[PDB]
Each structure stands twice: as C-alpha cells, then as structure tokens.
Amino acid sequence: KELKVLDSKTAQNLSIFLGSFRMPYQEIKNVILEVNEAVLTESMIQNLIKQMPEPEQLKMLSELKEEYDDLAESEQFGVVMGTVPRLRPRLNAILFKLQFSEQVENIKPEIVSVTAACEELRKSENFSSLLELTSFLCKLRDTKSADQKMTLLHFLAELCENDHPEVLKFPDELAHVEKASRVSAENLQKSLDQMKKQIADVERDVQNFPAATDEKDKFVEKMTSFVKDAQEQYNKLRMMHSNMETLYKELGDYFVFDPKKLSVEEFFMDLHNFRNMFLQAVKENQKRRETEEKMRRAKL
Amino acid sequence: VKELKVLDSKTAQNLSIFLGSFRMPYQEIKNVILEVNEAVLTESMIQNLIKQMPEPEQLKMLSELKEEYDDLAESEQFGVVMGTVPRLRPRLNAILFKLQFSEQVENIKPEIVSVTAACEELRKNFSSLLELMTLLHFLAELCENDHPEVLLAHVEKASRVSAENLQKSLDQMKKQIADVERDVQNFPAATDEKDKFVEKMTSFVKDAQEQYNKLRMMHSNMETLYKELGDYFVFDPKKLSVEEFFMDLHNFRNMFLQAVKENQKRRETEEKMRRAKL
Amino acid sequence: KELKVLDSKTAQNLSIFLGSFRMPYQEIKNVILEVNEAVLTESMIQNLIKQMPEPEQLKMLSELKEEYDDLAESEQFGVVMGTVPRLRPRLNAILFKLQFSEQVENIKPEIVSVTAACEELRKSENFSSLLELTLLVGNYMNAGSRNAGAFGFNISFLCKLRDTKSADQKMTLLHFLAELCENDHPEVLKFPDELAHVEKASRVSAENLQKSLDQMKKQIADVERDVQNFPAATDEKDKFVEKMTSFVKDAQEQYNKLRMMHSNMETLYKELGDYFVFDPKKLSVEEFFMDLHNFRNMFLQAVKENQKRRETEEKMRRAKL
Amino acid sequence: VKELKVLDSKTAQNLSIFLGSFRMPYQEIKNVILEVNEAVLTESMIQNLIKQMPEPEQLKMLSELKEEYDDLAESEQFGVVMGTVPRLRPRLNAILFKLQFSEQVENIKPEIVSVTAACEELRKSENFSSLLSFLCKLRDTKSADQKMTLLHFLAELCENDHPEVLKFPDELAHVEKASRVSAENLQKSLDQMKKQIADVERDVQNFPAATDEKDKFVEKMTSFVKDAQEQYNKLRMMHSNMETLYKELGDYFVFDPKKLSVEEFFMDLHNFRNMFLQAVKENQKRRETEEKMRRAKLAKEKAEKERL
C-alpha cells in the first residue's frame, strides 16, 4: 500500500512499533482515553509520545479516512489517533501521572540524607568532644605532634583512645554523613524546579481541557484529582527541602562557618573524609603500638 | 529511652531505620494506603512497607495499647496506627499487584509476539532450501545458477525465548489475579470513607482480567501456529521446543548466508583475475 | 587507486582498520614476527585476525610486488602480510599466549573454591558437632517426628528439617535444633565462619570447569602442533619458534598443575560422597554445596526467628501489668 | 595457635584470607616472580601481591627468622619467603608495568588518532571551508513567515544551487570523537607514561645482579624498557604531530589555538555539522510533505471528477 500523508521513515517506525506492539488501534485509543492503568506503563506512553505523527499530519490523515482499508497499518493508526482530542497534552498528563510518585521518591532521599546528617552532627556530643581536644580539620594529618614520627591526628586519636573511649564512637553517630556528601544541592534544586513546572503544565492542560465528546474519555475526571494530590505532595517536599537548607544554616552558626561559600555536598564530603582519616589513624596507632610491643619483646 | 512492649528487638530496629528515612506522619501513611494515593505509592514503597510491616499478631497486641501512644517508641507508634487498617496485608498485596500488573504484561507479551512473528514469517520461501566445499555452498551454488533469488526478523528473538518460563509466567499471573480477586470478595465493610479499596480494586481486577484473557489468547494462538509448523515440517511440537526449533532454524539461516557470502567473495575475486590477465 | 584482488567490502573494512591504526605496514609485520609484547594486545591480535584478508586472497597479492606503490593501501597491507609464513596459526598462537594467564586465573578459583569447601567441611569442629546434635535431635529427641531414628549425615535432608514439626508442634525440627544449639551448645553457632568457601563452591559449574580444562588442553596441543610444524625462520626478526616453544612448555606446566588440582578436587569430592553418602557422579559439586549453603542460611534464619519468638514470648509475660 | 612474631594483627588476618584463596605454595610464588613467568603472572595477580605484601620493615624482621620457619604461622612463612626476594617492590612494580604497558598505549593512541584524523578531514573539505557562531542566530530568528527558520532558508539555497554540500557532513567521520577527547588528559597520560618508564628504567639500572639461574628480571626488564621507550617515543611523535595539525588549523581558519582547546574547537564544529544536517533533514521533510499534499488534492480532485 502507498503512503498518502506520513513521510518515509516516520511510517517506517510506526510499522515497526505497532507491529511488535500487537494491539488493535481502537484498543489503543480507548486505553489512552480511559487511561487504563492495566495496560499503560511509563515506557508505553514514552513510546507513543516518541512515535506519534505530528499534529499537522494527523489532521491530514483524518481529512480523508473514507479509504481506511486502503491505508497502510501505519496510516490507519494515524487515522484513529486523529480521533483523540488534545492528544499530546493528554499523553503528557498521563505520563506525568505514571512518573510523579517515583520521581518524588528519587528526590526525597537526597533531602532526607542531608537533613539527617545535619541533625546527626548537631546532636552528636562525641563529635563535639572531639572538637574540644582539637571544616579545616582534614589538615591535622598534615602536621606534627608533641614528639615526632606521628601526625597530630594520631596523637589526637591516641589521646582519644586512651582516656576518651567515647569520642571513638562519633563516626557511629554520623550515619548519614556519607550519603550527604554524595548529594548535589544544585541538582536537588533543579529537580524541584522541573517538577514545579511539570505540575504547572499538566494543571494548565487540564484546566484548559474540553468536555466529554465521548462518554469514554475520563481524562479530566481523574487527572484533576491527581494533580491535586501531586500538589499536596510537592508542597510537603519543598517544605522538607526548605527545612534542609534551613538546618544547614544553623550548623553555619553553632560550628561557625560560611554556608554560602561551602555547599552542603562539599561541606559534608570533608567531614566524611575526616571521619575516615580518624578511623584510619586509629588503625595505624593500633599497628604501631603492636609492633613496638614486639620491639621491646625482642630485647628479651 | 522508650521501652518496647510488643515489637521484638530487630523488628523495632528495622522499623525505626525505615521510618526515619521515609519521613512521613504515620496517620498520613495510613491514609495513603487507605485511598491508594497513587501520587505517593510506588512499587518500592509497597514492597518496603510489606517487608517492614510487623506481623499481624504484633499489630494486634499493639492496637490493644493505643492508650499510652505518647509513651511508645516511634517504631511502636507506627504499629498502633497501622494496626487500625483492616486487612493490612491482603490490601498491601493487592496494591502491589495493581502497581505491577501492566509492567508484567508488558514484559510477557514480547516473548509471545516474537515467537508468533517467527511462525508467521516462516509460512510466508525458505521451505525449499535444505531437504534437497560443503552441502550449504553446493545448494547455495545452485540457488545462484538455476533457482536464484530463493534466498525472519523474529527468528533470532524466538530463539532466545523459553516456552517453559513463558507458561509459568502466565500461570503465575493467573494465580495473582485470582488471589487478589478472592481477597477483594472476602474484604470487610469500608467504614472509614477514606478507604476507596474495594471499589478501585474490583474495577482494576476487572481490567487485569480482560488483559490477562487477551494475553492468554495470544499465547494459545502462538502455540497453535507452532503446531501448524509441526505439519509443514512434520515434527513433534513437543519433542522440540519452540526455543530449539527456531534455534536451529536460526543457526541455519546464518550458515547458509555465510556460505553465500563466502561464495560471492570467491565470485568477485575471479573477476579480479579475468581482467588482470587481459 | 583500484583493487586487483580483494573483494569490495574487505578493502573498505581493512582501510578503516589500517587507518585508525596508524603504523607502517612493515612495522606491523615486525610486531607480529617479533611477538613484541610492548605493542601487541589481545584486542589488537583479535582485530588483525578478524580483518585479515583470506589466505588465498593473500596468495594472489603475492604476484603484485612490482606495482606495490600502484596498489591501494588496503592491498599494500595484504602484500606485506602475504610475506609472513603461517600467518593465521601464528596469529592464533600469539592470541593464545596473550590470553593464557587470564584463562588460568579464571579456572583456578573454581577449583580452589570447591577444594577449600571440602577441606573446610572436614575440619569444621562446630559443623561436625552440629551433625551430631542433628542425629541426637532426629533419632532421640523427637520420637513422634517423621523419620525418627533414621537421620544420618545427608545434607539435603538437613535442608528439610525446616519442613518437619518437632515433638511439641510449636517448632520445626530446624528451630528445635537451633534452640538446642543456642541453649546448650553455643560454640556450634559459630560453624558458619568455618565454612568460608561454601557459598563460592555452590556457584561453581563442574561441567563448565571440565570443559574449560579440556578446551585449554586442546588449545595448547594445537599450538604445540603448529610450533612443531613451523617453517625454519628466514627473517631474523621471526621470534615465533623461539618464544612459542618456550611458552608452550610453560603453559603445559600450568595446565598440568590445573589438571592435578582439579583431580585432587574430584578426589576430595568422592570422599565427601562416602561420608555424606551421595553419588559424586549424580550430585554435581554445585548441587551439594548449594544444599550445604542453603542449610547454613536457614539455620541462621532459624536462630533469629527463635530469638524473636523468645523475645515476644516475654512480652506476653510482662503483659501481666 | 602459632604466635605472630612480626606482623600486626590486621596484616596477618588479611594475609591469611588472601593466602587462603590464592593457594599458591610460597616457593612457587617466589619462583614465578623471579622468572617473571608470563604463562602465570597477570596484572590482577601482581596488584594483589603488592597490596597484600607486608611493608619492608616487617619483611626484614621476618627475614631474620628463617631458622624457625616451620614454627611460624602461614602468613609469616609467606613473609619470610617473600622477604628473601631482592628489591621486591621495584621488582613487582616493574612487572606490573610490563604487563600493563601495551594496553595503556592502546588506550591513548585512539584519542590522538581521532583528533588527528579530524584535523585531516577538515583541512581536506572545501565543502566546509566555504560555509561562512552565526549559524546559531539563523536558527534563532524565524523566516519571513513563522512557517520557517533562516537556517532552513540558507540550507535549502545551498541544497539547490550548491548540492555539493550534502556530502560535507559525511566527510567529517572523526569530528564527534574529537569533540569528546580531552587535550589536557592526553598530555597527562603521556607524561605519566614517560615517568613510569623512567622509574622502571631507573630501577633496572640500580638493580642487583642475579645470584641464581632463575632470576630473569634484569634480562627481561632491560630489554622491555627499551621496547617501551621506542613505543612511547612513537606515541609522542604522533601526539606532537596532532598538536601541530591543530596549530595548522589555527591559521587555515584563523583562531588562537591556546585560547580554544581541542575539545572546544571540534565541539562547536560538531554542533555546526549537526545544526546544518538538522535543517536539511527538516527541509527535506516538509518538502516531502508538500509533495504529498499536492498529490492529495490531485487525487481528491480526479475523485470528484471521475465521480461526476
């Protein structure tokens, strides 16, 4: 059969897609209309969106379907899809509905890690004690101590291990520090923004959606109810993200440091590095004070 | 601080770690579960909820302690709140089912489509080309002089499929639906109007049912056509599995094509001999 | 330029290859002859083999040396390669030599995992104690139970203690056993640490292991063959016979060691078959260790489930508030 | 059981786990290192020996316990044998270098070749030399009627009265690869390689003579070091020639080679190729559509005609 609208490759792709898809065009239409969640999936929508003929082509494909049987499977599909009101925006609202909960799930953790880390630090007394005996802390390893052949870090860690068995527990109170050092405050924000726009757009497309030109189209029906809930959820998320940014300020005072020059990621990435440096030093002392124990046995 | 009166040490430890990262008011989590709030629920969440959810007996014992709610630890408070959601488990398993269904159909369908296509692709020239250097090159040779042009995009896919697991999946799906359906039919009376469970589920189960039926039609069909193959190439549709049939048919299409490519390479290399000599 | 021998595609492919390769065709030839390992790599040899014009096609390009400069580069290369004796077996032997160490390194651990698992099983004082408690549990402390009086050392059977109720039906034999250990034989609980290679042994494939060895055996035999029949070197830069004769001996040495290690592995396994009464020729190594592994896992799960059950059972006691 | 006499608790624990899985008799490990046995040694094997190896100070203290070898724990016996290998560390590092060399060269060459080939393809394509950053502004502002873009416009003009540009995009095979390369990293790779070769070379020169017929280190490394240098020199020849062809472009296209890095240059040049083909692709698209709309009316006309 010959093509009367679709262009070469475009038809080439639809032929494939729909083929390995295997599903009556009318069923696809009704699945899209009723938003059948027993059929629809993230990818399925991404594929329809990525394979759907341009609107201008759909208008051309429907402006002469009296010869339906005479159209290639690719263009027959085109005709059907030409019957769906507000196709593209409809598809995005649907895609959004399928993606939301999960893209929130992907964000929240970042926020919680940082939040927890900040909470952990402030409430960590052992780390406070460690500060006494003492951001610019990953430098102790780069100095010397009372005597020689032992970085200040070691002496600090040893002094801790001898009569401060407790300070040697601070790493076990800074659980989320590592997860926090992995976060990207920049990216964290971009996400909440893209999301902000995402919800806005879908709300618009809905508040601008037509009426029931077919008692099968139950779009505005659900979608309006969803956006509502997606909103309540986005707000709560933003509040969490604010509580984070906020709690990170409090540390900028208590531990006194500039929360404008040092990002949340960078900051913690160092506190984490130091926490390791400390654990490393402790292991090194245990080694030294283990071989030296022999160097004195070798005199016997 | 805060003694445990029901949860066992480890359950409490785990529930605590879990809640402390989920970060969400327990009552709100309850509502989310009740109304199957799809703007919050995800496959992971449900699975995690199911994995962490204290056992029924522990939830009960806790529900009989709502009294000192403020004295109970976080882990045990979540318990009290969850201990008020009727049919927690079958409910959670139904939601997990709704969240997973379309995905599993999407992952099962392609296996059937490939195999089906390979079957359709065959019936619709490669027949005469085997029954009749090596034998391949020989027959290939003839299909170049006397019967040329007598030289399947799914035959390859079909060879990687596994008929056995394909059946197990459909059978596994069948149970899943039947189980959800049963749980729904045996569900309590929704007092708290915030519980839109029986409604949603009864409807979804209907849809999954229609899709499963359609999916099973595609299956049986696939097998029907496979036997149509046991006719033309007269063989035991059970002695040789779909996987194998197309595996051979595949290793075949290759060797022949290679035999052809090899022939043509000698072919041209001869042209680059007739000219060079004159 | 214009092709005098090579088909069209071969000329194309070979060009892109020689191109993004940048190296005088003679230099390439010397690298192959000298088996220069400061240049040669596994990928490099594989490609030369994949892109090398057919043996016959190289023969033809031999009558075209006068017009070397007239020929297209793809064919110039063909002209050079055409000068190298036993080009393909040579190339295959070099690839073999470059891959040999990794190959041994990938077979050895399978053998070491199974072997160590067997030794660990023999030497585990706590697992041995556990077997005894198992006999005690099924032959004397649960007369009611399933096969009471017929328990032995079958490992897969131990995997079923989980599916059988003990005397009082408030516990499976597995849990009964676990509690017995926890209460009166704590040390036994440390048996898992005494079986470090068991999990790895469960993931092995005796069949593939055997295939790997036989393959290595043929690979080495083939190279030796090719070396035994190799033509006397004309060009001084041809180090093949020199390097490869030596290598083959070395590789044969390693393979024999592998074969013997594998043979020792099979011997220990036969011993396990008589001790845990199973047929080595019917219960693959991975099957046996998967059973031992799964048992170790469920036994540990059983212990946690007991502690849990014990803890909540105390909340029932303190319910008297 | 078996009291440790030198090793620190951790090292011994780790050595034990390691030796538990490596399972190669200690003499055999030494023999293999001394023979530099290629049928046995692997990059991974050597990296693990290096990582597990007790520090020099411990190997020396164990080196003085040969008489009690049989009473020592497995990890310390291993230490004793290893302790008898002269220049163990430089030996192990040179061996690792010899195993890694040809491949780290193989991972550098490609980049140099991509950029090099790109520079060559460019200079040999007048098809581009002509087309004259701004190409962006055209794609920005719409044509007379919003119906099109000024880039499509220029693209169609070329496509009509200069159809010898449809090839341009296909004569820039390595430009994309070149856009991904990193000039700075390439340099480091080369300097890092030079240093590695120097250090090994140094160790071979200051290396103790063999006192047994099994130690093949000097014989092999001295020879290999010569081969690595030859290859490195050639690798550098290629590199500088790459920097030179690029320099040549700073003129043939007037632009400061110091300012704009190699990645920067071919990245823009990559996007350009993209933007153009884009327009051409798009033009051919809407022009194909117009064609079908024409045949649409024609048929829809012969229709109403044949009908009546």
CSV table of C-alpha atoms in Angstrom, one decimal, chain D:
chain,number,residue,atom,x,y,z
D,1,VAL,CA,47.6,-21.1,67.6
D,2,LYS,CA,51.0,-20.1,66.1
D,3,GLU,CA,52.1,-16.8,67.7
D,4,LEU,CA,52.8,-13.9,65.3
D,5,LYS,CA,56.3,-12.7,65.8
D,6,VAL,CA,56.4,-9.7,63.5
D,7,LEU,CA,53.2,-9.0,61.6
D,8,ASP,CA,50.5,-6.7,63.1
D,9,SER,CA,47.1,-8.4,63.8
D,10,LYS,CA,45.4,-6.9,60.7
D,11,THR,CA,48.1,-7.6,58.2
D,12,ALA,CA,48.2,-11.2,59.4
D,13,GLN,CA,44.4,-11.5,59.2
D,14,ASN,CA,44.4,-10.2,55.7
D,15,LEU,CA,47.4,-12.2,54.5
D,16,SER,CA,45.6,-15.3,55.8
D,17,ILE,CA,42.4,-14.6,54.0
D,18,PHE,CA,44.3,-13.7,50.8
D,19,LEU,CA,46.6,-16.8,51.0
D,20,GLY,CA,43.6,-18.8,51.7
D,21,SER,CA,42.2,-18.1,48.3
D,22,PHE,CA,45.4,-17.6,46.3
D,23,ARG,CA,46.6,-21.0,47.3
D,24,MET,CA,49.9,-21.0,45.6
D,25,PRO,CA,52.8,-22.6,47.5
D,26,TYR,CA,55.1,-19.8,48.7
D,27,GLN,CA,58.2,-21.1,46.9
D,28,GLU,CA,56.1,-21.2,43.7
D,29,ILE,CA,55.0,-17.6,44.2
D,30,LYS,CA,58.7,-16.5,44.5
D,31,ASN,CA,59.8,-18.7,41.6
D,32,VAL,CA,57.1,-17.1,39.4
D,33,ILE,CA,58.1,-13.5,40.4
D,34,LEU,CA,61.8,-14.3,39.8
D,35,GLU,CA,61.1,-16.0,36.4
D,36,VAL,CA,58.6,-13.2,35.6
D,37,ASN,CA,56.6,-16.2,34.3
D,38,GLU,CA,54.3,-14.8,31.6
D,39,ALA,CA,52.3,-18.0,31.5
D,40,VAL,CA,51.3,-17.3,35.1
D,41,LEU,CA,51.6,-13.7,36.0
D,42,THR,CA,48.5,-11.4,35.5
D,43,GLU,CA,48.0,-7.8,36.1
D,44,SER,CA,45.5,-8.7,38.8
D,45,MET,CA,47.8,-11.2,40.5
D,46,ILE,CA,50.6,-8.7,40.8
D,47,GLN,CA,48.3,-5.9,42.0
D,48,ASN,CA,47.1,-8.2,44.8
D,49,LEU,CA,50.6,-9.2,45.8
D,50,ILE,CA,51.6,-5.6,46.0
D,51,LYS,CA,48.5,-4.7,48.1
D,52,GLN,CA,48.9,-7.7,50.5
D,53,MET,CA,52.7,-7.5,50.8
D,54,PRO,CA,53.8,-6.8,54.4
D,55,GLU,CA,55.7,-3.5,54.5
D,56,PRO,CA,59.6,-3.6,54.0
D,57,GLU,CA,60.3,-3.3,57.7
D,58,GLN,CA,58.2,-6.4,58.5
D,59,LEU,CA,59.7,-8.5,55.7
D,60,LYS,CA,63.2,-7.6,57.1
D,61,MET,CA,62.3,-8.6,60.7
D,62,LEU,CA,60.9,-11.9,59.3
D,63,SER,CA,63.9,-12.3,57.1
D,64,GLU,CA,65.8,-13.0,60.4
D,65,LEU,CA,63.5,-15.8,61.4
D,66,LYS,CA,64.4,-18.4,58.8
D,67,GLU,CA,65.5,-20.9,61.4
D,68,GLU,CA,62.0,-21.1,62.9
D,69,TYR,CA,60.2,-21.1,59.6
D,70,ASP,CA,58.4,-24.3,60.5
D,71,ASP,CA,57.0,-22.8,63.7
D,72,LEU,CA,55.7,-19.7,62.1
D,73,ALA,CA,52.1,-19.0,61.1
D,74,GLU,CA,51.3,-19.3,57.4
D,75,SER,CA,51.2,-15.5,56.9
D,76,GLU,CA,54.6,-15.1,58.4
D,77,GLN,CA,56.2,-18.0,56.5
D,78,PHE,CA,54.9,-16.3,53.3
D,79,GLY,CA,56.6,-13.2,54.7
D,80,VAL,CA,59.9,-15.0,55.1
D,81,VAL,CA,60.0,-16.3,51.6
D,82,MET,CA,58.9,-13.0,50.2
D,83,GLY,CA,61.5,-11.4,52.5
D,84,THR,CA,64.2,-13.2,50.5
D,85,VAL,CA,63.4,-11.5,47.2
D,86,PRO,CA,65.8,-8.7,46.5
D,87,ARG,CA,64.2,-5.4,45.6
D,88,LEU,CA,60.8,-7.0,45.9
D,89,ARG,CA,58.8,-3.7,45.5
D,90,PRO,CA,60.6,-2.3,42.5
D,91,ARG,CA,60.5,-5.8,41.0
D,92,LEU,CA,56.8,-6.1,41.5
D,93,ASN,CA,56.1,-2.6,40.1
D,94,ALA,CA,58.2,-3.1,37.1
D,95,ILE,CA,56.5,-6.4,36.4
D,96,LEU,CA,53.1,-4.7,36.7
D,97,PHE,CA,54.3,-2.0,34.3
D,98,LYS,CA,55.4,-4.6,31.8
D,99,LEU,CA,52.0,-6.3,31.9
D,100,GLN,CA,50.0,-3.0,31.6
D,101,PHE,CA,52.1,-1.1,29.0
D,102,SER,CA,50.9,-2.2,25.6
D,103,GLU,CA,47.3,-1.7,26.8
D,104,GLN,CA,47.8,1.7,28.3
D,105,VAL,CA,49.3,2.7,25.0
D,106,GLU,CA,46.3,1.1,23.3
D,107,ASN,CA,44.1,3.4,25.3
D,108,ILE,CA,45.9,6.6,24.4
D,109,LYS,CA,46.5,6.1,20.7
D,110,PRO,CA,42.8,6.3,19.7
D,111,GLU,CA,42.3,9.8,21.1
D,112,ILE,CA,45.3,11.1,19.3
D,113,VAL,CA,44.1,9.4,16.1
D,114,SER,CA,40.6,10.7,16.4
D,115,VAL,CA,41.8,14.3,16.8
D,116,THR,CA,44.5,13.8,14.1
D,117,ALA,CA,42.1,12.3,11.6
D,118,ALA,CA,39.6,15.0,12.4
D,119,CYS,CA,42.1,17.7,11.6
D,120,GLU,CA,42.9,16.0,8.4
D,121,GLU,CA,39.3,15.5,7.3
D,122,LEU,CA,38.6,19.2,8.0
D,123,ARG,CA,41.5,20.6,6.0
D,124,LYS,CA,40.6,18.3,3.1
D,125,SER,CA,37.0,19.5,2.9
D,126,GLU,CA,36.5,22.8,1.0
D,127,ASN,CA,32.8,21.8,1.3
D,128,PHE,CA,33.0,23.3,4.8
D,129,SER,CA,35.8,25.8,4.2
D,130,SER,CA,33.2,27.8,2.2
D,131,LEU,CA,30.1,27.8,4.5
D,132,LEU,CA,30.6,31.1,6.3
D,133,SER,CA,28.8,31.0,15.8
D,134,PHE,CA,26.4,32.9,13.5
D,135,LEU,CA,24.8,29.7,12.2
D,136,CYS,CA,23.1,29.9,15.6
D,137,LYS,CA,21.4,33.3,15.1
D,138,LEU,CA,19.8,32.0,11.9
D,139,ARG,CA,18.3,29.1,13.7
D,140,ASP,CA,17.0,31.6,16.3
D,141,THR,CA,15.1,34.2,14.2
D,142,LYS,CA,12.2,32.9,12.1
D,143,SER,CA,11.9,33.4,8.4
D,144,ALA,CA,9.5,35.9,6.7
D,145,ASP,CA,6.6,33.8,8.0
D,146,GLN,CA,6.9,32.0,11.3
D,147,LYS,CA,6.5,29.0,8.9
D,148,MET,CA,10.3,28.6,8.8
D,149,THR,CA,13.8,29.4,10.0
D,150,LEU,CA,16.5,31.5,8.4
D,151,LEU,CA,18.8,28.4,8.8
D,152,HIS,CA,16.4,26.2,6.8
D,153,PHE,CA,16.4,29.0,4.2
D,154,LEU,CA,20.1,29.1,3.8
D,155,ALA,CA,20.1,25.3,4.0
D,156,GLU,CA,17.7,25.0,1.1
D,157,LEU,CA,19.5,27.6,-1.0
D,158,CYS,CA,22.7,25.6,-0.7
D,159,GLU,CA,20.8,22.4,-1.3
D,160,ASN,CA,19.6,23.8,-4.6
D,161,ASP,CA,22.4,26.0,-6.1
D,162,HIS,CA,25.3,24.1,-4.4
D,163,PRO,CA,24.2,20.4,-4.0
D,164,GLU,CA,27.9,19.6,-3.2
D,165,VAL,CA,27.3,20.1,0.5
D,166,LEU,CA,25.1,17.1,1.1
D,167,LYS,CA,28.4,15.3,1.4
D,168,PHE,CA,30.1,17.7,3.8
D,169,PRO,CA,28.6,16.0,6.9
D,170,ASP,CA,29.9,12.6,5.8
D,171,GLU,CA,33.5,13.8,5.3
D,172,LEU,CA,33.9,14.6,9.0
D,173,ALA,CA,34.0,11.0,10.3
D,174,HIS,CA,36.1,11.7,13.4
D,175,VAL,CA,34.8,15.1,14.4
D,176,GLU,CA,32.4,13.7,17.0
D,177,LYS,CA,35.1,11.5,18.5
D,178,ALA,CA,37.4,14.5,18.6
D,179,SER,CA,34.8,16.6,20.4
D,180,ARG,CA,34.8,14.1,23.3
D,181,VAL,CA,38.6,13.9,23.7
D,182,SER,CA,40.4,15.8,26.4
D,183,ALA,CA,43.7,17.6,25.4
D,184,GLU,CA,44.8,18.0,29.0
D,185,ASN,CA,44.2,14.4,29.9
D,186,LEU,CA,46.1,13.2,26.8
D,187,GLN,CA,49.1,15.2,28.0
D,188,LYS,CA,48.9,13.8,31.5
D,189,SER,CA,48.6,10.2,30.1
D,190,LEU,CA,51.8,10.9,28.1
D,191,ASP,CA,53.8,12.5,31.0
D,192,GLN,CA,52.6,9.8,33.4
D,193,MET,CA,53.8,7.2,30.9
D,194,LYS,CA,57.1,8.9,30.5
D,195,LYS,CA,57.6,8.9,34.2
D,196,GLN,CA,56.6,5.3,34.7
D,197,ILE,CA,59.1,4.2,32.0
D,198,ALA,CA,61.8,6.4,33.6
D,199,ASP,CA,61.2,4.9,37.1
D,200,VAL,CA,61.3,1.3,35.9
D,201,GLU,CA,64.4,2.2,33.8
D,202,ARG,CA,65.9,3.7,36.9
D,203,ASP,CA,65.1,0.5,39.0
D,204,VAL,CA,66.6,-1.7,36.3
D,205,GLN,CA,69.8,0.3,36.2
D,206,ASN,CA,70.3,0.2,40.0
D,207,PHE,CA,69.2,-3.5,40.2
D,208,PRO,CA,71.3,-6.2,42.0
D,209,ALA,CA,72.8,-8.8,39.7
D,210,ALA,CA,71.2,-12.2,39.7
D,211,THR,CA,72.7,-14.8,42.1
D,212,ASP,CA,70.7,-17.7,40.7
D,213,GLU,CA,69.7,-19.0,37.3
D,214,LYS,CA,66.0,-18.5,37.9
D,215,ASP,CA,66.0,-14.7,38.3
D,216,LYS,CA,65.2,-13.3,34.8
D,217,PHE,CA,64.4,-9.8,35.9
D,218,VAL,CA,67.3,-7.8,34.6
D,219,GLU,CA,67.4,-9.7,31.3
D,220,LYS,CA,63.7,-9.2,30.6
D,221,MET,CA,63.2,-5.7,32.1
D,222,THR,CA,66.3,-4.2,30.5
D,223,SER,CA,65.0,-5.4,27.1
D,224,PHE,CA,61.4,-4.5,27.7
D,225,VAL,CA,62.3,-1.0,28.9
D,226,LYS,CA,64.0,-0.5,25.5
D,227,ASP,CA,60.8,-1.5,23.8
D,228,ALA,CA,58.6,0.7,25.9
D,229,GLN,CA,60.8,3.7,25.1
D,230,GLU,CA,60.6,3.1,21.4
D,231,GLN,CA,56.8,2.8,21.6
D,232,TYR,CA,56.5,5.9,23.9
D,233,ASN,CA,58.7,7.9,21.5
D,234,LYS,CA,56.4,7.0,18.6
D,235,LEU,CA,53.4,7.7,20.7
D,236,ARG,CA,54.8,11.2,21.4
D,237,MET,CA,55.7,11.7,17.8
D,238,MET,CA,52.0,11.1,17.0
D,239,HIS,CA,50.9,13.4,19.8
D,240,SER,CA,53.0,16.4,18.8
D,241,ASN,CA,52.0,15.9,15.2
D,242,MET,CA,48.5,16.1,16.5
D,243,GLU,CA,49.2,19.3,18.2
D,244,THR,CA,50.8,20.6,15.0
D,245,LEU,CA,47.9,19.8,12.7
D,246,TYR,CA,45.7,21.6,15.1
D,247,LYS,CA,48.1,24.5,15.2
D,248,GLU,CA,47.9,24.5,11.3
D,249,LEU,CA,44.2,25.0,11.7
D,250,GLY,CA,44.5,28.0,13.9
D,251,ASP,CA,45.7,29.6,10.7
D,252,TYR,CA,43.8,27.9,7.9
D,253,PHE,CA,40.8,29.1,9.9
D,254,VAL,CA,42.3,32.0,11.9
D,255,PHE,CA,41.8,31.4,15.6
D,256,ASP,CA,44.0,31.2,18.7
D,257,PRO,CA,45.0,27.6,19.4
D,258,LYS,CA,45.9,28.5,23.0
D,259,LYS,CA,42.6,30.0,23.8
D,260,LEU,CA,40.2,27.4,22.4
D,261,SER,CA,41.1,23.9,23.4
D,262,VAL,CA,40.9,20.9,21.0
D,263,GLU,CA,37.7,19.7,22.6
D,264,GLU,CA,36.2,23.2,22.4
D,265,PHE,CA,37.0,23.6,18.7
D,266,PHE,CA,35.7,20.3,17.4
D,267,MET,CA,32.7,20.5,19.8
D,268,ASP,CA,31.5,23.7,18.1
D,269,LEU,CA,32.4,22.2,14.7
D,270,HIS,CA,30.4,19.2,15.7
D,271,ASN,CA,27.3,21.2,16.6
D,272,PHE,CA,27.6,23.1,13.4
D,273,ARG,CA,27.5,19.9,11.4
D,274,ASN,CA,24.5,18.9,13.4
D,275,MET,CA,22.5,22.2,13.1
D,276,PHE,CA,23.0,22.1,9.3
D,277,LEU,CA,22.0,18.5,8.7
D,278,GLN,CA,19.2,19.2,11.0
D,279,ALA,CA,17.9,22.0,8.8
D,280,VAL,CA,18.5,19.9,5.7
D,281,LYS,CA,16.7,16.9,7.2
D,282,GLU,CA,13.8,19.2,8.2
D,283,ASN,CA,13.6,20.9,4.9
D,284,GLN,CA,13.6,17.6,3.0
D,285,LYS,CA,10.8,16.6,5.4
D,286,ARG,CA,8.4,19.5,4.9
D,287,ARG,CA,9.2,19.4,1.2
D,288,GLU,CA,8.3,15.8,1.1
D,289,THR,CA,5.0,16.6,2.9
D,290,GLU,CA,4.2,19.4,0.5
D,291,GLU,CA,4.7,16.8,-2.3
D,292,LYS,CA,2.1,14.5,-0.6
D,293,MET,CA,-0.3,17.4,0.0
D,294,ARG,CA,-0.1,18.1,-3.8
D,295,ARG,CA,-0.9,14.5,-4.7
D,296,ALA,CA,-3.5,14.7,-2.0
D,297,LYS,CA,-5.5,17.4,-3.9
D,298,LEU,CA,-4.8,15.9,-7.3
D,299,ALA,CA,-6.3,12.5,-6.2
D,300,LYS,CA,-9.1,14.2,-4.3
D,301,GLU,CA,-9.8,16.1,-7.5
D,302,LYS,CA,-9.6,13.3,-10.0
D,303,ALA,CA,-12.0,11.8,-7.5
D,304,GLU,CA,-14.8,14.3,-7.6
D,305,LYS,CA,-14.2,14.3,-11.3
D,306,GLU,CA,-14.3,10.6,-12.1
D,307,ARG,CA,-17.3,10.5,-9.8
D,308,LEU,CA,-19.5,13.0,-11.7
